[PDB]
Amino acid sequence: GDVTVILNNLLEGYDNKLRPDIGVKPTLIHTDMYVNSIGPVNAINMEYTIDIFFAQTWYDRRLKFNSTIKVLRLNSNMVGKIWIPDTFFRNSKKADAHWITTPNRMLRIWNDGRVLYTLRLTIDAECQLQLHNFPMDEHSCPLEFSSYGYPREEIVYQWKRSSVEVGDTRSWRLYQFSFVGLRNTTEVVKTTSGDYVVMSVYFDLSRRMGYFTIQTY
Amino acid sequence: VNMDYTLTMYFQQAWRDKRLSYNVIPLNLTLDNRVADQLWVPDTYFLNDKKSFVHGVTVKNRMIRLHPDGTVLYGLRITTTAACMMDLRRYPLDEQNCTLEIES
Amino acid sequence: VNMDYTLTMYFQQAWRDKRLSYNVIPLNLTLDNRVADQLWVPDTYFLNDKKSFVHGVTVKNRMIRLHPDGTVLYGLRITTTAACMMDLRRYPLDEQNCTLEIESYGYTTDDIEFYWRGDDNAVTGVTKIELPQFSIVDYKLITKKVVFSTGSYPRLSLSFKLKRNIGYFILQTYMPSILITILSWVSFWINYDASAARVALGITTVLTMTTINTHLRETLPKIPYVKAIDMYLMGCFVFVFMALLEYALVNYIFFSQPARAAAIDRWSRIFFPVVFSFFNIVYWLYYV
Amino acid sequence: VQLQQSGAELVKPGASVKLSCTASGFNIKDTYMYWVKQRPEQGLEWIGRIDPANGDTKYDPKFQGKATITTDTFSNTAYLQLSSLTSEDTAVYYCARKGLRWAMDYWGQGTSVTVST
Amino acid sequence: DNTTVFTRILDRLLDGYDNRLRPGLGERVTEVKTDIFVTSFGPVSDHDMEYTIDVFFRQSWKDERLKFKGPMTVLRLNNLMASKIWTPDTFFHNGKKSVAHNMTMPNKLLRITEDGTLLYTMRLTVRAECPMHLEDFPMDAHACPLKFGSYAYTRAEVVYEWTREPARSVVVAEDGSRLNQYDLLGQTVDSGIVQSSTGEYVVMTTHFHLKRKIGYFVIQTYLPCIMTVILSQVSFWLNRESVPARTVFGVTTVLTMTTLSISARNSLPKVAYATAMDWFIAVCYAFVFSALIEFATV
Amino acid sequence: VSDHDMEYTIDVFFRQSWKDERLKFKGPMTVLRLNNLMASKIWTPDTFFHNGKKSVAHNMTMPNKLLRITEDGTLLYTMRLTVRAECPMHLEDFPMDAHACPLKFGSYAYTRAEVVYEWTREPARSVVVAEDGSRLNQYDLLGQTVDSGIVQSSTGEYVVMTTHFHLKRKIGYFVIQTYLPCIMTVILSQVSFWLNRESVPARTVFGVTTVLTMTTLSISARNSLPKVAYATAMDWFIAVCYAFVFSALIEFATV
Amino acid sequence: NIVMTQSPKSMSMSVGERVTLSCKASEYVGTYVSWYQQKPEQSPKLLIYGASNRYTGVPDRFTGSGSATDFTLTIGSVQAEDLADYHCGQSYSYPTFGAGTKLELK
Ligand SMILES: *[C@@H]1O[C@H](CO)[C@@H](O[C@@H]2O[C@H](CO)[C@@H](O[C@@H]3O[C@H](CO[C@H]4O[C@H](CO[C@H]5O[C@H](CO)[C@@H](O)[C@H](O)[C@@H]5O[C@H]5O[C@H](CO)[C@@H](O)[C@H](O)[C@@H]5O)[C@@H](O)[C@H](O[C@H]5O[C@H](CO)[C@@H](O)[C@H](O)[C@@H]5O)[C@@H]4O)[C@@H](O)[C@H](O[C@H]4O[C@H](CO)[C@@H](O)[C@H](O)[C@@H]4O[C@H]4O[C@H](CO)[C@@H](O)[C@H](O)[C@@H]4O[C@H]4O[C@H](CO)[C@@H](O)[C@H](O)[C@@H]4O)[C@@H]3O)[C@H](O)[C@H]2NC(C)=O)[C@H](O)[C@H]1NC(C)=O
Ligand SMILES: CCCCCCCCCCCCCCCCCCCC(=O)O[C@H](COC(=O)CCCCCCCCCCCCCC)COP(=O)(O)OCCN
Ligand SMILES: CCCCCCCCCCCCCCCCCCCC(=O)O[C@H](COC(=O)CCCCCCCCCCCCCC)COP(=O)(O)OCCN
Ligand SMILES: *[C@@H]1O[C@H](CO)[C@@H](O[C@@H]2O[C@H](CO)[C@@H](O[C@@H]3O[C@H](CO)[C@@H](O)[C@H](O)[C@@H]3O)[C@H](O)[C@H]2NC(C)=O)[C@H](O)[C@H]1NC(C)=O
Ligand SMILES: *[C@@H]1O[C@H](CO)[C@@H](O[C@@H]2O[C@H](CO)[C@@H](O[C@@H]3O[C@H](CO)[C@@H](O)[C@H](O)[C@@H]3O)[C@H](O)[C@H]2NC(C)=O)[C@H](O)[C@H]1NC(C)=O
Ligand SMILES: *[C@@H]1O[C@H](CO)[C@@H](O[C@@H]2O[C@H](CO)[C@@H](O)[C@H](O)[C@H]2NC(C)=O)[C@H](O)[C@H]1NC(C)=O
Ligand SMILES: C[C@]12CC[C@H](OS(=O)(=O)O)CC1=CC[C@@H]1[C@@H]2CC[C@]2(C)C(=O)CC[C@@H]12
Ligand SMILES: *[C@@H]1O[C@H](CO)[C@@H](O)[C@H](O)[C@H]1NC(C)=O
Ligand SMILES: *[C@@H]1O[C@H](CO)[C@@H](O)[C@H](O)[C@H]1NC(C)=O
């Protein structure tokens, strides 16, 4: 009906290569998560699998419409036509989105340009476990993400108050360890390209004794 | 056993394209990584790699940043399984010399 | 362990499209393999495949070939890892039979018709297949019309019959157990006064047998029934255990009456090989 | 949205009665159509359902052969025909359509059949 | 020359169609009638606590923008037309790595009925998660779930529903059982609503009840354990003068029990509680150790 | 060279060159060293390896390809690709065998009447091997041997370019892992004869342990090779050593 | 055939008190138990579709409570027009209803 007209007017004269406010101010991106399950923490490879629902929300004054409908709710068919920040996880050995049956993505464009972009991820993050005190050892190892090409002067990330929210913590594949808590952190790193805003989520794992108690002791 | 090593790097190249030169604005443009399919980028390959891939989450992990004088800055995030033959005649008191060769 | 098998084939299909009919040039056109993305090709899929791919070096290995009357030929070079559910109740003396079901996905039987071209020379290159373990005994081509809740779709089936070779297993797992039993039999020619020698024999033999068994089971999946090799190993272990318990029975009544002990040792020397040969013969006649 | 059943019937024992249920407000090809009987002062009882898009009809094991359910997509009607009836099935027959969670949201009004002489 | 008229029909269908808008965007909640046909229940990986399942995932909604009037009633179109229309974005809530088959062409289907009722089936290989409580190993029974819902569409927009009676929706083929270790008993479907930070979503659930087969564990753990215990108790009928014989019996039986415990614990995931087989092996170890202690006392 | 799969990996620079008269040009330059995406807009032969299993065409960072259009229409098209080809082996002389692993490649869909292949240089000097280009841990590459032939499929009559790589296994590893322990076990079993006859437990232990060791060794040594249905040479050696050991045990029993 | 044992058979209760009805299924019925309210000389009206989901137009004093086999219908402040039969019917399989509970005022 008229939603087609709105969607056509939003993409007329739209360049998805230019971040919103390209020459004015940095783009503030609010990031949230939802940890489905923290997969097996195998110490041999110093890695651990995690499955999350990464949500990024920012303001785009170009996707600003004026109609009776307040919010436009869209699937992954319009994600490749607007600007999308290039958030990558700096400590992920191998990670990939989900594509069955349709690309697991969500795009919600509010009335004042506020965009929400949500996707499903399975990240094999890396953390060098200090294997002293084994098997009576406790680790707290992170998941770090930041923009790739945009330095601190262009893209600034910022946690929400209730950003990271774990699930049930019971149907997870944490066999040898036990989830005890988490904490979010924001810092600034220096690279050959520029200064980047690096966000981190630290998960605290405590190795529960058992398997080793009955396997070797 | 496989005689190879795996490394993850931020491979970055910098050339000067006199066609992508502008002077009306003074800032360094950082375009979306989808414009790297419309520009010219050098055909750099690693000779002794076996399996390689540019990370692709949440987008294709590459940067393409122009400068007002034409300088193009093109970065990737690669994970190469470079092959290096090892001489184990003094195992385990041995020193391996594993290299990575970058060629056009 | 995965109950699958990988086969590489040159899969060719031939239909008749009247829209691709030309009567100007008299030669059978052979176009680049990229024009197949602009024609109609049937939606054929293998029902029992798990991981397959068209070889893509140096190009996508496919052939498209028109004819001046509309006939289209369309070949691919596929490598399917089909699923092969095996009944291992006779392993390793077993003959397997697992198929390759070729069905059309979208089009019912009132929209497409599958048929082997030649109907007996359709599948070639089977008598040149040299497997390291099995050996193709027979192959059959079938034509059916399966029924799902969305219609009745055509189906072709290509079925092999692989008979497993027994040389490797006779070499690796039957002979060591047989020779371990022969060694266990030596414990009867030793005098019954020797308590360490005979015990050493019987205990080393027992442990050896059981370890061999456990190791042999690591190469197979968690199959809940008793294979043939498992039956042989259990019989050999029973024979070893009986030898050890016959030395123990001799050692029990040795001090009381050595005549009975010597008689039992003679009877064992005579009747362990006889019972073992009888069991071995009935085994190799029940399975072969 | 509005299901109109037939009127009351006074049928002799040993005959066949065909009750009609006209659906106004929707198309019967979208949902199923259940037929329910209820004897006086007793619980509801299922007779059978029909999928008007195909014609697949399922019946209660104790109603198989006695009743048959047909449809008419042009007039959006469901017909229930009682093949052979005794003097005991003097109940009230309701016509219902399946709802959201497989419930029967919209019922008919009831054609109270009567078997006597 | 039906090709031209059917091309005209298709071009009229897609003329003025927006595949970014669900059918009935303003005045309706889309009703997706799903269905599943399990062609083969794959092997339940006990190490990863996952399981594979090969399905014919069927969906069917009502699109009023795809009404036509021609010679045919049902348009059995190609799987490439399904990308130019709106199709629900059903994702599996617990699937780990699902693949959609592309041999030899995309294994999909699309039948557009004349009144707009669509039908869209896919052939999937879902590797879902089956959390297991291995406290009765190897006499345990599991209920492996399969939850699928919509992404980006809350409950006020896209509601899912089974297409037949919920008891007859999930069908399993007769010969489709790649289970070598377990034994599939039956399915059990259910429909609920999950809250979230974004909205309320409809979630369809399907549990496949399993039951492990104890034959292999019997053969490879319980028989060797019992035989070792017997071989150990044999050391009591030997005379007291033969010390080395009984010492060999005891030591070798203790070593055999140790290696049996080791080989029995390797099959299971690295779990941090004690299973039933663990208790059996502990008791057999206690018996052999007590036999050795009794011989030492004698 | 993987012995279990009877396959071998190779990493080549596949160069091809034909003459397309539709690409004649006269300009300031003689040759045009164009990108690798221009090669997707012209005709390029569809060469495939008749005995390849899973070959990859490297595209790191860009697609690894090369296209040079000479001014007279002559094209040069080079690819960099890893081929995982098949190599059926006859292991009756294991571990003292020698193989000739082939690399056959021809065209797909173009018969002999349409596309014919040839070597660019002399057939002896075509397939070149780099000096430091050898990842053979166990084997030893002797030399290449090329040939051209004509095969017949169900579709037509094609031209097949064959290349054999002559390999010769190194016995160094198998000596120390199988033949030395077997010989040492045989010697250890023959030591039992020099012991005194009044020491039954010692000689019995010798015999039973030597037999157990021989059994474990015969099981371990077979694990390396694929499950073939004939007896290799190492298997014959192991069988003879097992014979000797068992005969020594039976000689102690007789004594 | 799934049978639904509904309890009690017939209850009498005064105005304004909380009341509860129980419906125990024989086999498994996930949440496909519906509650219908049939007033005398009328057709049954759907109250609770699925377990614990009021139908459009149902007062908030009706509440469902679901499980695998046991289901409950609780009415809160009971008014004077709630004197009718209350049938529970599963739909996980071919629909089978319960016997119904004659609610009464006293
Ligand atoms: C070296 O060579 C390598 C091999 O060539 C090469 O890898 C290839 O890279 C390219 C580019 O990076 C990949 O192509 C992209 O893939 C994206 C997603 O990839 C995932 O999925 C593919 C499989 O793709 C199927 O499934 C998706 C999801 O359903 C479909 O969207 C696809 O179309 C495709 O569907 C077909 O196949 C199905 C069977 O699988 C059928 O069922 C179906 O019916 C179709 O027939 C996987 O293979 C990927 O795995 C690989 O990549 C991951 C990355 O992490 C690796 O980890 C992994 O190991 C594998 O390597 C992965 O899982 C596509 O989304 C993408 O297409 C979009 O983008 C392009 C460019 O922007 C658009 O032009 C295009 O139109 C698509 O955009 C539309 O759709 C998106 C949906 O999100 C919309 O948001 C967007 O707005 C747009 O919609 C608009 O247009 C639509 C029409 O296009 C229209 O319908 C809409 O309405 C709207 O108008 C692109 O295809 C390719 O997959 C890789 N291949 C392999 C084998 O990896 C590698 O890069 C090379 N290296 C270098 C250094 O160069
Ligand atoms: C339903 C059964 C479930 C039980 C679970 C485990 C049980 C283990 C197996 C049974 C234990 C003993 C069996 C019964 C006792 C034997 C009867 C005669 C022995 C006897 O007379 O008692 C003294 C103890 O000897 C002995 O028998 C010494 C050994 C007994 C215990 C040794 C401790 C071993 C610890 C095992 C655990 C270690 C690892 C576990 C993971 C001998 O001498 P006396 O002079 O005192 O007799 C006094 C008279 N003259
Ligand atoms: C159960 C106990 C086990 C535990 C430990 C056992 C062994 C430890 C004993 C320590 C001392 C042993 C002495 C060994 C010296 C070094 C062994 C390296 C062998 C080796 O790799 O040489 C290959 C020579 O190939 C050849 O041509 C050699 C093959 C011919 C071997 C002849 C065998 C001797 C038979 C006569 C024995 C007489 C018995 C008494 C009657 C190399 O080969 P490459 O391919 O790397 O190239 C290079 C030249 N070829
Ligand atoms: C799954 O199988 C289907 C069909 O076999 C594949 O579809 C094919 O995908 C390729 C690449 O996207 C298409 O080629 C493209 O054609 C466009 C012109 O429309 C051109 O601009 C592009 O540069 C590219 O050459 C091809 O047309 C298409 N074929 C069909 C019949 O749709 C699909 O890629 C396969 N997916 C996977 C993951 O293997
Ligand atoms: C391997 O296993 C397959 C699967 O069981 C065997 O296929 C079966 O072959 C027989 C004989 O060709 C088929 O019987 C035929 O049935 C039709 C039914 O009308 C009848 O007209 C024929 O005269 C014949 O009786 C049987 O249907 C077929 N199985 C299925 C499921 O269709 C195959 O024979 C086995 N052997 C080999 C070497 O593959
Ligand atoms: C996640 O990040 C937010 C933002 O940094 C943290 O919220 C702050 O919490 C501290 C103490 O709890 C307050 O003093 C601040 O006022 C909060 N800031 C905002 C913007 O709300 C939150 O604590 C972090 N979560 C953790 C560490 O678990
Ligand atoms: C031979 C065995 C038992 C099995 C083990 O032998 S091993 O070759 O497998 O380690 C350990 C071992 C060492 C000492 C051996 C013993 C068997 C019994 C013996 C001969 C006695 O009466 C006195 C010395 C004893
Ligand atoms: C652009 O990058 C160059 C490289 O260091 C830097 O000197 C210059 O300041 C940058 N431009 C701006 C506007 O910061
Ligand atoms: C085309 O193919 C047919 C069948 O293979 C053959 O009979 C005919 O001669 C071919 N045409 C030409 C021009 O070779």
PDB file of N, CA, C and O in Angstrom, chain A residues 16-17 80 86-90 92-93 95 121 148-151 154 193 196, chain B residues 10 27 30-32 34-35 55 57-59 61-63 65 75-77:
ATOM      1  N   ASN A  16      24.639   4.004   0.342  1.00  0.00           N
ATOM      2  CA  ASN A  16      24.964   3.124   1.454  1.00  0.00           C
ATOM      3  C   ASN A  16      26.456   2.937   1.630  1.00  0.00           C
ATOM      4  O   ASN A  16      26.875   1.971   2.273  1.00  0.00           O
ATOM      5  N   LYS A  17      27.264   3.836   1.074  1.00  0.00           N
ATOM      6  CA  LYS A  17      28.700   3.843   1.297  1.00  0.00           C
ATOM      7  C   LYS A  17      29.135   4.936   2.256  1.00  0.00           C
ATOM      8  O   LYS A  17      30.307   4.970   2.640  1.00  0.00           O
ATOM      9  N   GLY A  80      21.001  -4.959   3.039  1.00  0.00           N
ATOM     10  CA  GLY A  80      22.038  -4.610   2.096  1.00  0.00           C
ATOM     11  C   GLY A  80      21.803  -3.354   1.296  1.00  0.00           C
ATOM     12  O   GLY A  80      22.524  -3.120   0.325  1.00  0.00           O
ATOM     13  N   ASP A  86      30.443  -1.840  10.346  1.00  0.00           N
ATOM     14  CA  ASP A  86      31.265  -3.026  10.097  1.00  0.00           C
ATOM     15  C   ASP A  86      31.859  -3.546  11.406  1.00  0.00           C
ATOM     16  O   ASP A  86      33.067  -3.592  11.600  1.00  0.00           O
ATOM     17  N   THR A  87      30.977  -3.952  12.308  1.00  0.00           N
ATOM     18  CA  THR A  87      31.417  -4.463  13.596  1.00  0.00           C
ATOM     19  C   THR A  87      32.007  -5.854  13.430  1.00  0.00           C
ATOM     20  O   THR A  87      31.380  -6.737  12.840  1.00  0.00           O
ATOM     21  N   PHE A  88      33.229  -6.041  13.914  1.00  0.00           N
ATOM     22  CA  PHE A  88      33.880  -7.339  13.900  1.00  0.00           C
ATOM     23  C   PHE A  88      34.436  -7.637  15.283  1.00  0.00           C
ATOM     24  O   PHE A  88      34.764  -6.727  16.047  1.00  0.00           O
ATOM     25  N   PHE A  89      34.536  -8.924  15.594  1.00  0.00           N
ATOM     26  CA  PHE A  89      35.005  -9.382  16.895  1.00  0.00           C
ATOM     27  C   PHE A  89      36.502  -9.649  16.815  1.00  0.00           C
ATOM     28  O   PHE A  89      36.940 -10.522  16.062  1.00  0.00           O
ATOM     29  N   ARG A  90      37.281  -8.902  17.597  1.00  0.00           N
ATOM     30  CA  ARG A  90      38.729  -8.880  17.432  1.00  0.00           C
ATOM     31  C   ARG A  90      39.426 -10.140  17.915  1.00  0.00           C
ATOM     32  O   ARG A  90      40.596 -10.337  17.576  1.00  0.00           O
ATOM     33  N   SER A  92      38.036 -13.446  17.668  1.00  0.00           N
ATOM     34  CA  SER A  92      37.295 -14.592  17.165  1.00  0.00           C
ATOM     35  C   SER A  92      38.154 -15.366  16.173  1.00  0.00           C
ATOM     36  O   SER A  92      38.568 -14.815  15.149  1.00  0.00           O
ATOM     37  N   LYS A  93      38.431 -16.632  16.482  1.00  0.00           N
ATOM     38  CA  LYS A  93      39.155 -17.474  15.540  1.00  0.00           C
ATOM     39  C   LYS A  93      38.321 -17.730  14.293  1.00  0.00           C
ATOM     40  O   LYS A  93      38.798 -17.552  13.168  1.00  0.00           O
ATOM     41  N   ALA A  95      33.985 -17.327  13.149  1.00  0.00           N
ATOM     42  CA  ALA A  95      32.621 -16.991  13.518  1.00  0.00           C
ATOM     43  C   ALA A  95      31.792 -16.852  12.253  1.00  0.00           C
ATOM     44  O   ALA A  95      32.317 -16.518  11.190  1.00  0.00           O
ATOM     45  N   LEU A 121      24.612 -14.886  15.812  1.00  0.00           N
ATOM     46  CA  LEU A 121      26.021 -15.190  15.598  1.00  0.00           C
ATOM     47  C   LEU A 121      26.472 -16.366  16.450  1.00  0.00           C
ATOM     48  O   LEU A 121      25.961 -16.590  17.547  1.00  0.00           O
ATOM     49  N   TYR A 148      35.812  -1.958  12.112  1.00  0.00           N
ATOM     50  CA  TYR A 148      37.014  -2.362  11.390  1.00  0.00           C
ATOM     51  C   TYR A 148      37.702  -1.170  10.734  1.00  0.00           C
ATOM     52  O   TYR A 148      38.881  -0.912  10.988  1.00  0.00           O
ATOM     53  N   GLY A 149      36.985  -0.441   9.886  1.00  0.00           N
ATOM     54  CA  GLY A 149      37.587   0.644   9.141  1.00  0.00           C
ATOM     55  C   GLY A 149      37.371   2.032   9.705  1.00  0.00           C
ATOM     56  O   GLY A 149      38.076   2.964   9.316  1.00  0.00           O
ATOM     57  N   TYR A 150      36.422   2.193  10.625  1.00  0.00           N
ATOM     58  CA  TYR A 150      36.086   3.511  11.140  1.00  0.00           C
ATOM     59  C   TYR A 150      36.764   3.739  12.479  1.00  0.00           C
ATOM     60  O   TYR A 150      36.476   3.006  13.435  1.00  0.00           O
ATOM     61  N   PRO A 151      37.653   4.725  12.607  1.00  0.00           N
ATOM     62  CA  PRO A 151      38.295   4.964  13.904  1.00  0.00           C
ATOM     63  C   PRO A 151      37.383   5.665  14.897  1.00  0.00           C
ATOM     64  O   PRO A 151      36.198   5.875  14.632  1.00  0.00           O
ATOM     65  N   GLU A 154      34.846   8.486  14.056  1.00  0.00           N
ATOM     66  CA  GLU A 154      33.724   8.227  13.164  1.00  0.00           C
ATOM     67  C   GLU A 154      32.675   7.305  13.762  1.00  0.00           C
ATOM     68  O   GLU A 154      31.484   7.564  13.604  1.00  0.00           O
ATOM     69  N   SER A 193      46.123   2.029  11.642  1.00  0.00           N
ATOM     70  CA  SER A 193      45.151   2.835  10.919  1.00  0.00           C
ATOM     71  C   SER A 193      44.653   4.021  11.735  1.00  0.00           C
ATOM     72  O   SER A 193      44.483   5.115  11.191  1.00  0.00           O
ATOM     73  N   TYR A 196      40.717   3.189  17.802  1.00  0.00           N
ATOM     74  CA  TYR A 196      39.439   2.503  17.711  1.00  0.00           C
ATOM     75  C   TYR A 196      38.844   2.289  19.094  1.00  0.00           C
ATOM     76  O   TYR A 196      39.561   2.062  20.070  1.00  0.00           O
TER      77      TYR A 196
ATOM     78  N   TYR B  10      46.288  -8.809  10.193  1.00  0.00           N
ATOM     79  CA  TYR B  10      45.623  -7.659   9.576  1.00  0.00           C
ATOM     80  C   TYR B  10      46.471  -7.175   8.403  1.00  0.00           C
ATOM     81  O   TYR B  10      47.269  -6.250   8.518  1.00  0.00           O
ATOM     82  N   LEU B  27      38.907  15.974   4.498  1.00  0.00           N
ATOM     83  CA  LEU B  27      38.933  14.804   5.362  1.00  0.00           C
ATOM     84  C   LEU B  27      39.217  13.532   4.568  1.00  0.00           C
ATOM     85  O   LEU B  27      39.060  13.481   3.347  1.00  0.00           O
ATOM     86  N   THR B  30      36.265   7.303   4.565  1.00  0.00           N
ATOM     87  CA  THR B  30      36.243   5.877   4.874  1.00  0.00           C
ATOM     88  C   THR B  30      34.942   5.323   4.313  1.00  0.00           C
ATOM     89  O   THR B  30      33.879   5.470   4.921  1.00  0.00           O
ATOM     90  N   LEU B  31      35.025   4.701   3.146  1.00  0.00           N
ATOM     91  CA  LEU B  31      33.845   4.176   2.489  1.00  0.00           C
ATOM     92  C   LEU B  31      33.496   2.795   3.031  1.00  0.00           C
ATOM     93  O   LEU B  31      34.293   2.133   3.696  1.00  0.00           O
ATOM     94  N   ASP B  32      32.277   2.358   2.730  1.00  0.00           N
ATOM     95  CA  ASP B  32      31.860   1.012   3.085  1.00  0.00           C
ATOM     96  C   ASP B  32      32.704  -0.004   2.328  1.00  0.00           C
ATOM     97  O   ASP B  32      33.135   0.235   1.199  1.00  0.00           O
ATOM     98  N   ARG B  34      32.059  -2.316   0.626  1.00  0.00           N
ATOM     99  CA  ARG B  34      31.486  -2.806  -0.615  1.00  0.00           C
ATOM    100  C   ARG B  34      31.977  -2.029  -1.825  1.00  0.00           C
ATOM    101  O   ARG B  34      31.767  -2.477  -2.956  1.00  0.00           O
ATOM    102  N   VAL B  35      32.632  -0.885  -1.614  1.00  0.00           N
ATOM    103  CA  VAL B  35      33.201  -0.125  -2.723  1.00  0.00           C
ATOM    104  C   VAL B  35      34.514  -0.712  -3.205  1.00  0.00           C
ATOM    105  O   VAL B  35      34.974  -0.360  -4.296  1.00  0.00           O
ATOM    106  N   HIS B  55      37.898 -13.051   7.020  1.00  0.00           N
ATOM    107  CA  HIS B  55      36.797 -13.153   7.963  1.00  0.00           C
ATOM    108  C   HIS B  55      35.590 -12.405   7.412  1.00  0.00           C
ATOM    109  O   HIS B  55      35.736 -11.360   6.775  1.00  0.00           O
ATOM    110  N   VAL B  57      32.363 -11.661   9.384  1.00  0.00           N
ATOM    111  CA  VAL B  57      31.339 -11.374  10.382  1.00  0.00           C
ATOM    112  C   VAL B  57      31.739 -10.103  11.122  1.00  0.00           C
ATOM    113  O   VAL B  57      32.893  -9.974  11.536  1.00  0.00           O
ATOM    114  N   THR B  58      30.809  -9.158  11.291  1.00  0.00           N
ATOM    115  CA  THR B  58      29.420  -9.253  10.852  1.00  0.00           C
ATOM    116  C   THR B  58      29.277  -8.866   9.391  1.00  0.00           C
ATOM    117  O   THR B  58      28.247  -9.111   8.772  1.00  0.00           O
ATOM    118  N   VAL B  59      30.324  -8.257   8.849  1.00  0.00           N
ATOM    119  CA  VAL B  59      30.444  -7.971   7.435  1.00  0.00           C
ATOM    120  C   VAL B  59      31.786  -8.518   6.966  1.00  0.00           C
ATOM    121  O   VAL B  59      32.575  -9.029   7.757  1.00  0.00           O
ATOM    122  N   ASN B  61      35.310  -8.493   6.560  1.00  0.00           N
ATOM    123  CA  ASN B  61      36.266  -7.738   7.366  1.00  0.00           C
ATOM    124  C   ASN B  61      37.330  -7.142   6.453  1.00  0.00           C
ATOM    125  O   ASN B  61      38.433  -7.668   6.301  1.00  0.00           O
ATOM    126  N   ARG B  62      37.002  -6.009   5.842  1.00  0.00           N
ATOM    127  CA  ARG B  62      37.999  -5.268   5.091  1.00  0.00           C
ATOM    128  C   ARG B  62      37.718  -3.781   5.220  1.00  0.00           C
ATOM    129  O   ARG B  62      36.582  -3.362   5.448  1.00  0.00           O
ATOM    130  N   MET B  63      38.776  -2.996   5.082  1.00  0.00           N
ATOM    131  CA  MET B  63      38.728  -1.545   5.137  1.00  0.00           C
ATOM    132  C   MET B  63      39.213  -0.979   3.814  1.00  0.00           C
ATOM    133  O   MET B  63      40.181  -1.480   3.241  1.00  0.00           O
ATOM    134  N   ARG B  65      39.920   2.955   2.536  1.00  0.00           N
ATOM    135  CA  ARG B  65      39.924   4.341   2.987  1.00  0.00           C
ATOM    136  C   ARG B  65      40.709   5.175   1.989  1.00  0.00           C
ATOM    137  O   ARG B  65      41.878   4.884   1.714  1.00  0.00           O
ATOM    138  N   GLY B  75      42.795  -2.644   3.685  1.00  0.00           N
ATOM    139  CA  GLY B  75      43.159  -3.611   4.701  1.00  0.00           C
ATOM    140  C   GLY B  75      42.216  -4.796   4.715  1.00  0.00           C
ATOM    141  O   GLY B  75      41.032  -4.664   4.417  1.00  0.00           O
ATOM    142  N   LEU B  76      42.748  -5.949   5.101  1.00  0.00           N
ATOM    143  CA  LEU B  76      41.991  -7.183   5.221  1.00  0.00           C
ATOM    144  C   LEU B  76      42.357  -7.848   6.536  1.00  0.00           C
ATOM    145  O   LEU B  76      43.363  -7.518   7.163  1.00  0.00           O
ATOM    146  N   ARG B  77      41.541  -8.812   6.939  1.00  0.00           N
ATOM    147  CA  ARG B  77      41.784  -9.616   8.133  1.00  0.00           C
ATOM    148  C   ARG B  77      41.819 -11.072   7.693  1.00  0.00           C
ATOM    149  O   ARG B  77      40.774 -11.711   7.554  1.00  0.00           O
TER     150      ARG B  77
END
